[PDB]
A paper describes a structure:
We present here cryo-electron microscopy structures of substrate-free and nicotinamide adenine dinucleotide (NADH)-bound SpNOX and of NADPH-bound wild-type and F397A SpNOX under turnover conditions. These high-resolution structures provide insights into the electron-transfer pathway and reveal a hydride-transfer mechanism regulated by the displacement of F397. As for other members of the FNR superfamily, a transient displacement of a C-terminal aromatic residue is necessary to perform hydride transfer. Here, we analyzed the steady-state kinetics of an F397A SpNOX mutant. Similarly to nNOS, we did not observe a large effect on the KM, which suggests that F397 does not have a major role in the control of NADPH-binding affinity in SpNOX. As for the F397S SpNOX mutant described in the previous study, we observed a moderate increase in kcat, which could be explained by the elimination of the F397 displacement step. These data are supported by further analysis of a cryo-EM structure of the F397A mutant bound to NADPH under turnover conditions at 2.64-Å resolution. Density can be observed for the bound substrate but, compared to the other substrate-bound structures described here, the nicotinamide is closer to the isoalloxazine ring. The absence of the large side chain of F397 allows NADPH to take up a productive conformation in SpNOX for pea FNR Y308 mutants. In this conformation, the nicotinamide ring does not lie parallel to the isoalloxazine ring but at a ~26° angle.
Evolutionarily distant proteins with the NOX catalytic core have been found in bacteria, including Streptococcus pneumoniae NOX (SpNOX), which is proposed as a model for studying NOXs because of its high activity and stability in detergent micelles. NOXs belong to the ferric reductase transmembrane component-like domain (FRD) superfamily and are composed of a catalytic core with two conserved domains: a domain with six transmembrane helices (TM domain) coordinating two hemes by four conserved histidine residues and a C-terminal cytosolic dehydrogenase domain (DH domain) containing the flavin adenine dinucleotide (FAD)-binding and NADPH-binding sites. The DH domain catalyzes a hydride transfer to FAD, which subsequently transfers electrons stepwise to the two transmembrane hemes. The structure of SpNOX corresponds to the canonical NOX structure, with an N-terminal TM domain that coordinates two hemes and a C-terminal DH domain bound to FAD.
Residue numbers in the entry: 2 to 400
C-alpha cells in the first residue's frame, strides 16, 4: 500500500494527467483520450529509467515498477478506445497505419510482459525493448496526423513535444546508455568463498570508494568468459570503502554459474546503491526477520558495526542446518554484543516462525527480508499485537 513516503511521485503523475487533460480540452477536445495515453506512455518510459530521483519520489524501486505497470495498462486501455472509436484493423493512409503498427506492438509486448514469467529474463528484456519501436512509430503517427498543430508556439505544442521528448530520451537512456555509462564502479573479484552447498560469497575490490548504507543493494555485471553481462540485483553483504561483499545463492542459471564457474580476478562493474531498507535510520528498538538468503542486508550491518548501539532481536529462518549461512558470525556477534538477541529457527526442526505469542518491543521498527509469502503472514500478526509498529520490507522481484 502506498503512503506519504511515495506522495511526491504520485502527485507528479496526477499533475501530469490533469495538466494534459486541461491542455487538450481547451484546444482539441476530440483528442483528450489519445492525448492522455501519450502522456502515460511518456511516464512509463520515465518510470523505467532507474534514476535516483525516481526512487526518492516513489520510496522504493518496487513501487517505481508498480506504477510503471499501472501507466502501461492505462495507456493500452486508452489507445484501444482510441482505435475503436477512430479507426479499424488497418489504416488507409500511411499516418494511420503507423498507429496501427504501434498498437499491435504495444498490445503484443504488454501481453508478453505480463504472462512472461517462464521466459528467460534476457529474452524477456529483448522482447520488452520493442516498445521503443512502437513508441517511435506512435510519434510518427501523431506528428503526421496533427501536422503544423504541434509545431507552433502554443501550449499544446510545448506540452506534447516535451513529454514526447522526455519519453524518447528516457527510452534511449535505459535501453542503449544505462548499462554503458551508468556503471562507473569498475572492480575485480579478489576472494571467493563457498559458505554452504549452494551459496557463494564474492569479495570485490573497487578502484574508487563505494558509498552505501546497510540494507541497500546494487546491480552487478560480471565480465567473464561464459558469463552473461546483464545486471543482477544483489544486496551488499558487507565491506567498506574499496571493498564490497556479495553473497549469492544459486537460484537459476546465472547464480549457479557464479557458484561453480566464477573465478577470482574477473572484472565487475557496479552502478550505485539502491534501497529504502536503511537499518541505521530506524528506531532504537529493532526487530530483524530474515529468511534464507534474505539475511544478506543484515550481514552488512553486523560486519560494519562491531559494537551494536541498538536493541535488536534477530529471527533467522533456514531450511535445515545445510541451508544456513554465517552461523559462526551471528553467534560471535551475539556474544560480543549483549544487546543483540539471536533466534535461529530450523524450519524442519523448530517449525514455523509465528509471532502470535511472541512479544514485539514498544516503539520498534521491524525489518523483514525473505520470501514474500512468509513476510506477508508475519507482517499481519505483528500489526494485530502492536498497530503502532513500523514495518519495512524489501522484496526480490520486480515483475
Ligand atoms: C533488491 C534485490 C536484492 C537481491 N539480493 C539478493 C541477494 O543478496 N542474494 C541473492 O542470491 N539474490 C538476491 N536477489 C535475487 C537475484 O537478483 C536473482 O535471484 C538472480 O538475478 C537470479 O539469477 P538467475 O538468472 O540465475 O535466475 P533465473 O532463474 O534466471 O531467474 C529466476 C528469478 O530471478 C529473477 N531474475 C532473473 N534475472 C534477473 C535480473 N537480471 N534482474 C532481476 N531479476 C532477475 C526472475 O524475475 C525470477 O523471479 C535480489 C533481488 C532483488 C530484486
Ligand atoms: N533484500 C532483498 O530483496 C533480498 C532478496 N533475497 C531473496 O530472499 C529470498 C529468500 O528465499 P530463500 O533464500 O530460498 O529461503 P527459503 O524460502 O528457502 O527459506 C525461508 C524460510 O521461510 C520459511 N517460511 C516459508 N513460508 C513461511 C510462512 N508462511 N510462515 C513462516 N515461515 C515460513 C521456510 O520454512 P518452511 O520450510 O517451513 O516453509 C524457510 O525456512 C530469495 O528468493 C532471495 O532471492 C535475498 C537477499 C536479500
Ligand atoms: C507501454 C507499456 C510499457 C513500456 C513503454 C515499457 C517500457 C520499459 C522499458 C523501456 C524498460 C527497460 C528495458 C531495458 O532495460 O532494456 C522496462 C522495464 C521493465 N518493465 Fe516495462 N514497459 C511497458 C509495460 C510493462 C508491463 C506491462 C510490465 C508488466 C510486468 C512491465 C514491467 C517491467 C519491469 C519489471 C521492468 C524492469 C526490467 C528489469 O528489471 O531489467 N512493463 N519497461
Ligand atoms: C496526441 C495523440 C494522438 C492523436 C492526436 C491521434 C490522432 C488520430 C487520428 C486523427 C486518427 C484517425 C485516423 C485517420 O486519419 O483515419 C487516429 C487513429 C488511430 N490512432 Fe491515433 N492519435 C494519437 C495517439 C495515438 C497513439 C499514441 C497511437 C498508437 C500507439 C494511436 C493509434 C491510433 C490507431 C490505431 C488509430 C486507428 C488507425 C486507423 O484505423 O486508421 N494514436 N489517431
Amino acid at each position: 500500500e502506498f503512503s506519504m513516503k511515495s506522495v511526491k511521485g504520485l502527485l507528479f503523475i496526477i499533475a501530469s494527467f490533469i495538466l494534459t487533460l486541461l491542455t487538450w480540452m481547451n484546444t482539441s477536445p476530440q483528442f483528450m483520450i489519445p492525448g492522455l495515453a501519450l502522456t502515460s506512455l511518456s511516464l512509463t518510459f520515465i518510470l523505467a529509467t532507474r534514476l535516483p530521483l525516481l526512487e526518492s519520489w516513489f520510496h522504493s524501486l518496487e513501487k517505481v515498477y508498480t506504477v510503471h505497470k499501472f501507466t502501461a495498462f492505462l495507456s493500452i486501455i486508452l489507445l484501444i478506445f482510441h482505435n475503436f472509436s477512430m479507426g479499424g484493423l488497418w489504416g488507409s493512409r500511411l499516418a494511420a497505419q503507423f498507429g496501427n503498427l504501434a498498437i499491435y506492438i504495444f498490445a503484443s509486448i504488454i501481453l508478453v510482459a505480463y504472462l512472461g514469467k517462464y521466459i528467460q529474463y534476457e529474452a524477456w528484456r529483448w522482447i520488452h525493448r520493442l516498445v521503443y519501436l512502437a513508441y517511435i512509430l506512435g510519434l510518427f503517427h501523431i506528428y503526421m496526423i496533427m501536422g503544423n498543430r504541434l509545431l507552433t508556439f502554443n501550449l499544446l505544442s510545448f506540452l506534447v513535444g516535451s513529454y514526447a521528448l522526455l519519453g524518447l530520451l528516457a527510452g534511449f537512456y535505459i535501453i542503449f546508455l544505462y548499462q554503458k555509462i551508468s556503471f562507473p564502479y569498475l572492480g575485480k573479484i579478489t576472494h571467493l568463498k563457498r559458505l554452504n552447498h549452494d551459496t557463494r560469497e564474492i569479495q570485490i575490490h573497487l578502484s574508487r570508494p563505494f558509498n552505501y548504507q546497510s540494507g541497500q543493494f546494487a546491480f552487478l555485471k560480471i565480465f567473464q568468459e561464459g558469463f552473461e553481462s546483464a545486471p543482477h540485483p544483489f544486496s551488499i553483504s558487507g565491506g567498506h570503502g574499496q571493498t564490497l561483499y556479495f553473497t549469492v545463492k544459486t537460484s537459476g542459471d546465472h547464480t549457479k554459474n557464479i557458484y561453480d564457474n566464477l573465478q577470482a580476478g574477473s572484472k565487475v562493474t557496479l552502478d550505485r546503491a539502491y534501497g529504502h531498507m536503511i537499518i541505521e535510520e530506524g528506531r532504537e528498538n529493532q526487530v530483524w526477520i530474515a529468511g534464507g538468503i534474505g539475511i544478506t542486508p543484515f550481514i552488512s550491518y553486523i560486519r560494519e558495526h562491531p559494537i551494536l548501539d541498538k536493541q535488536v532481536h534477530f529471527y533467522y529462518s533456514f531450511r535445515g542446518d545445510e541451508n544456513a549461512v554465517y552461523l559462526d558470525l551471528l553467534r560471535n556477534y551475539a556474544q560480543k554484543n549483549p544487546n543483540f538477541e539471536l533466534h535461529l529457527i530450523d524450519s524442519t526442526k523448530d517449525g514455523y516462525l509465528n509471532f502470535e505469542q511472541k512479544e514485539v518491543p514498544e516503539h520498534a521498527t521491524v525489518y523483514m527480508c525473505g520470501p514474500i509469502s512468509m513476510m506477508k503472514a508475519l507482517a499481519k500478526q505483528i500489526k494485530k499485537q502492536n498497530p503502532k509498529t513500523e514495518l519495512i520490507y524489501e522484496g526480490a522481484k520486480f515483475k
